Design a protein around this ligand. Sequence first.
Ligand SMILES: [Ca+2]
Length: 376
Amino acid sequence: EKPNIIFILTDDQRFDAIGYAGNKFVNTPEMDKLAQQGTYFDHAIVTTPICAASRASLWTGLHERSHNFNFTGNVREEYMNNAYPKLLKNNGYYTGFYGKYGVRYDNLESQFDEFESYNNRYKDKRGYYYKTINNDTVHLTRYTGQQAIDFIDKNATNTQPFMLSLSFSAPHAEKYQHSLKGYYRMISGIDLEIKKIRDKLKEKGVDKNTVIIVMGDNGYFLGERQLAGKWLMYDNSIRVPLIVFDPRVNKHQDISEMVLNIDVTQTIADLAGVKAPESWQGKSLLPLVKQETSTISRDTILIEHLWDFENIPPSEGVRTEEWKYFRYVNDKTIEELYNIKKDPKEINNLIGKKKYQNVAKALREKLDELIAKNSD
Ligand SMILES: [Ca+2]
């Protein structure tokens, strides 16, 4: 009646960094199986390309304009409940988390083990669980992979459905020749854990009752613009691979070519039969996966932002099915506009030019008519 849900959350996984996207050098077969088995979202976009506000936007379901993270930094003396795990926990689920929480907030409940070492610390790392703290041996990817297995086999107890949130630290650390190789390698070892997870699901016999969701936390830069990192508002930095595979409601796939990350939070609660809080600034992706109504998402224009600190710049803009816009602020206002269907590598800025300065005014307007539509 109610499905078990598993949200795999990869750290720094580009929308390009998956075989289903044509990448011939990754080895993500179980993910590729999930995309062909479920509905893949190629134009899945992350609102704020930072591995902490995005993760917070995942929890609280509100854009960074509305939550406003911090650095590091704890947030926000329980704003935030109004939070998709804590909601299912108090409505009818046995929630569980393993990996990087990314908010530094001192509570957490049900069953967990947050890897607080410095996220990373390669092999062996500090882990904040129940009662107190205890650090453990082998390597992040395998450790949080085995913990998910244990959570399925053991006590996620068979009465109420479980919602297991998995936050992998991989692949968080030409060009660099084969450091792009090692990046791709770290995503290949997550798939081994996906084989073991869904293999564990058949022993307990719930794989036809456990919808699995996979996402990349934010974009990346691998030599584009002679740039690394993320945080800017280019497609390779905001777009991530989001797989939503439901073994119950739709046996067969359908590829969707539309938008957005803050939707998963709604896609969790709606999935769990729980009324999604009024605060959450997303929309459910359930109509898309069971091929229901609004197969054009009806989210014609979306937002994205970066409220920033150290060196350097921030940005905020909006995107459409074939139009992009964003302007920095610290320290400047370099307005930029690109056409998405003809310039996907975003090398031709189109502002100033008279034939498209009217579509810049329509997007510059809708940006203000989207920044304040979230507010607080
Ligand atoms: Ca990340």
